[PDB]
Assembly symmetry: C3
């Protein structure tokens, strides 16, 4: 019969394989951590993206760390549970008010760290006992809970903690993963509470994290980037099949990060290997998103892609408004005006195509000012039926606005 | 040892398999869509149950429109991706006033289709890439999101969408199915977050859909009708073992529609098969539901079954009311009247049995007017302790209210 | 490679195996039910820990009941179906005011009860049709719905109904279990609606139930006790490792009850066996709960583990107050006082360690009135930056307040 797929070993997002004599511990927007290791010595460097965060710093890998993660508040490290020493979690809170910026924790006996991440104001790790441990940046042990399966990876941004694990057994080459998403805020909540994780056929998970604006996203082995549509009931929307940015199967991409505004994907181009060449220091490439949409060669399909790209990449403004962070409303005004002008162009093209019911549907998707301009567009060429029905739809909108 | 179950192939909701010269591609409450295919052409025939919806219509193409759906506003068809054509969706928005009396849209390369459905001004389709495509019925591309697994079937009604897919790996004949439901009104919501789908042991899903009053329902291969009981925090209540009816004289009762006002299952009696042949014209058998309540030979059990069947069906009126749609208060009043009468009559039966605690328990399920009538009955029958307990219940309810 | 596991058969909490001649059918906080079959008689003995509740009861086991549950309100019994007689549900509502304290129900033909449980005024039964049936404690049939898989066990407390089932097939020793937690109160809800249930590796589920204070809890075959953390988004927090408490690690404890205030784990030690013998009668041992924190022998570890233990246990006060159940305000006063004096001592230790950012992180959990004491403590010995930043924290808390 069909075989069960082997579960993929856990990874740190943006990292590189352990065995490389030089490797990148993690690529991230704050600063690049890299390591040299061989049969007789081992050392770690951190190379900050902006030196105003902190100057570049170097350490000897005294306790043989194998995992790490960075934020602009602190840098974390973690090691294996050796026979002489169980797994240790280490931190330099380099941005602290106090000079006692270093601290370390050692797990109970026969327990090993499998993943580690940072947010803002907290740290987190997932261990070999299917047990997740929260900490503060200064190393107070916060609450603890058990995971439903072995962890694949984890990430964080602000009060958001993202975990992905093996919810079950994969079959005939496909993996079987689930996702938890926790709010470590004023009220502890769990928007995703073990839901299944979509993946491309016979693929495996390759990268996770958040955009710089705090929206969760991930990439699988086929390069299809998916992002959490918070508008459509917290569901995973694809945003880029990165294979089309490649010259072919010769190339892969290793994501450094994603920016929801400006609409950018930042990654290392890699040839042959999925992970980049370890030396010399590679240069980061930047790519543009295009949502996978049908008939995209046509201008109407292209602007449909532009519209849904605009709203999906300004969902973060709604999330910022809800969570209480500072943001500028001019961004939402720009997004609404741009996507409503695009919707105006679609309505004009549909009107010229005589698909006036499609114009009324587009006007249902419109804001009131755009419906008024659509009524004027329907008045051009004297299409009175469409103009009357657009006016009626405007009245219906006014009844609720 | 244990054996993995093979995943079943997808089916369009309410359709026959492709292994016959003539098929029902969809049979809704609206009407029937047939397909006859041979070496000459593929002939699609639409027959409305009421011609006031629209007249009988016929299409014919070399394209094999392998998937179909029907609604009061429009007809919908779709065809698979071939070695030279990508998939295409086809529609006839017959109710329209513009030039959208026909519409065709492509889908990308390798975007093979499994199932499609219709909504109030909406349309939807599932892809072999595990992306759900959403559209307006006039034909704008709406949002896209990633499906958690291979979809087995799909359905729609109003502003709500119902999806069933393969959640994991089955074993020993059981199929590991998951269910997802979304609502797309003013606030876009996700009711079922990818939860498991109950099924009879070693059964396979045979039909899904909505009741005509707008709640999801489905039937498995053993003939067990189930529906999403939203009076129980959205759990699956079984309603009918269709193999019972007419002492199982027909080897199957191929469901085509469900109603609860009146209480009517619409189905086709099938002899020696799970589905009927498309010609000669099968007759619609109408069957009444029978919930699987215990000790059904007794008056007590029959009154219980009547009461709970009534309340699960007439709970839909409150759902329709609170979600902002039109509903009928006379039917709600009749439902309440029958429920109070059933509780009163079975209270009298339990009084005859001297099971006064059952009488108080039944009084908990009815209003203050019925409780006062029961108190006066208790006074007439000189059951003072029963009257006192009912009076204490009335005092507690009045203090709470 | 991996191999599928045999999904374990259903069980009942505090039972011992059916093959025994003389066994416990249930042992809980209420009392004990024993059953035996020998040449002298086939019978069931019910007895209560507090004899004021009800006298010891004895029943001839002619119908061969096999599953049982005990509550303050009633005794509930069930049997597997044989060929001539169906599976039957039997109840003794001894706390009733009417003389007809017994009632009996007979299930549909070849339907078979596989688990039962009791609650405040209701009873539940899970059957071989993957069907859960609700009854009033006086035997009126309440609502019916389909389970997502074969059950393993059930439990009830007040309005809460806790169900665990097989959501799938496990591999490589593990069991694939899902948890479903209903509330049957004034509005029907699902707190957990099929979430995966954590387990230790290669374990099986050994015990389920509620604390006396009404929080769901369970124990796996590796002796790890887990409780539902309602203050952390309804995740699962381990609260005790019974293996560390044993005289020798080959032996293990058999749980019968849980209490949060006082913190008690009620269990029976077993000499070389999974469960205790029925005679000579076991003695219930008390074990203290222990969160699995790191560096737990240090003063930091002692303080923080006690803090988190205290707060996760005193979540039940919040649940009771939110759902309208009465409670003594002295419990909340004592909980807040203990937590605050403890965290004041922890603040003193972090202050003397001169980690003032850790002090701010610790004091973030506190009320500003209590943070004023830490401000004065920082003023003592002139820890100026610590005093200033605790003052800023108090000002921010007052600004939010």
């Amino acid at each position: 019969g069909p075989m069960p797929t082997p579960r993929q070993k856990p990874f740190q997002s943006g990292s590189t394989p352990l065995h490389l004599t030089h490797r990148f511990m993690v690529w991230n927007s704050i600063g690049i951590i890299r390591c040299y290791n061989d049969e007789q010595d081992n050392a770690i460097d951190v190379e900050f993206h902006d030196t105003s965060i902190h100057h570049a710093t170097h350490l000897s890998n005294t306790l043989n760390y194998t995992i790490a993660d960075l934020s602009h508040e602190a840098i974390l490290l973690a090691c294996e549970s050796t026979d002489e020493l169980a797994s240790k979690l280490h931190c330099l809170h380099f941005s602290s008010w106090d000079s006692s910026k270093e601290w370390i924790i050692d797990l109970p006996q026969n327990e090993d760290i499998e993943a580690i991440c940072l947010g803002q104001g907290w740290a987190a790790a997932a261990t070999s006992a299917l047990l997740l441990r929260l900490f503060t940046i200064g190393g107070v042990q916060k609450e603890v809970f058990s995971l439903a399966g072995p962890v694949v990876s984890m990430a964080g941004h602000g009060e958001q903690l993202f975990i992905v694990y093996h919810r079950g057994t994969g079959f005939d080459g496909d993996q079987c993963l689930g996702v938890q998403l926790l709010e470590l805020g004023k009220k502890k909540k769990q928007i995703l509470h073990g839901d299944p994780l979509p993946l491309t056929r016979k693929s495996y998970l390759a990268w996770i994290g958040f955009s710089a604006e705090g929206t969760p996203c991930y990439v699988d082995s086929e390069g299809i980037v998916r992002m959490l549509n918070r508008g459509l009931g917290n569901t995973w929307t694809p945003i880029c099949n990165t294979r089309e940015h490649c010259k072919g199967k010769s190339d892969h991409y290793w994501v450094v990060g994603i920016h929801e505004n400006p609409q950018q994907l930042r990654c290392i181009p890699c040839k042959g290997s999925r992970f980049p060449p370890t030396l010399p220091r590679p240069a980061v490439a930047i790519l543009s998103f295009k949502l996978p949409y049908c008939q995209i060669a046509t201008e109407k399909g292209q602007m449909e892609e532009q519209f849904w790209r605009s709203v999906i990449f300004h969902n973060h403004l709604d999330y910022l408004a809800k969570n209480g962070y500072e943001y500028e409303e001019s961004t939402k005004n720009q997004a609404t005006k741009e996507q409503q002008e695009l919707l105006m162009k679609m309505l004009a093209l549909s009107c010229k195509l005589e698909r006036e019911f499609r114009c009324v549907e587009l006007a249902d998707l419109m804001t009131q000012n755009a419906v008024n301009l659509a009524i004027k567009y329907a008045s051009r060429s004297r299409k009175l039926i469409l103009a009357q029905k657009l006016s009626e739809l405007a009245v219906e909108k006014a009844a609720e606005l």
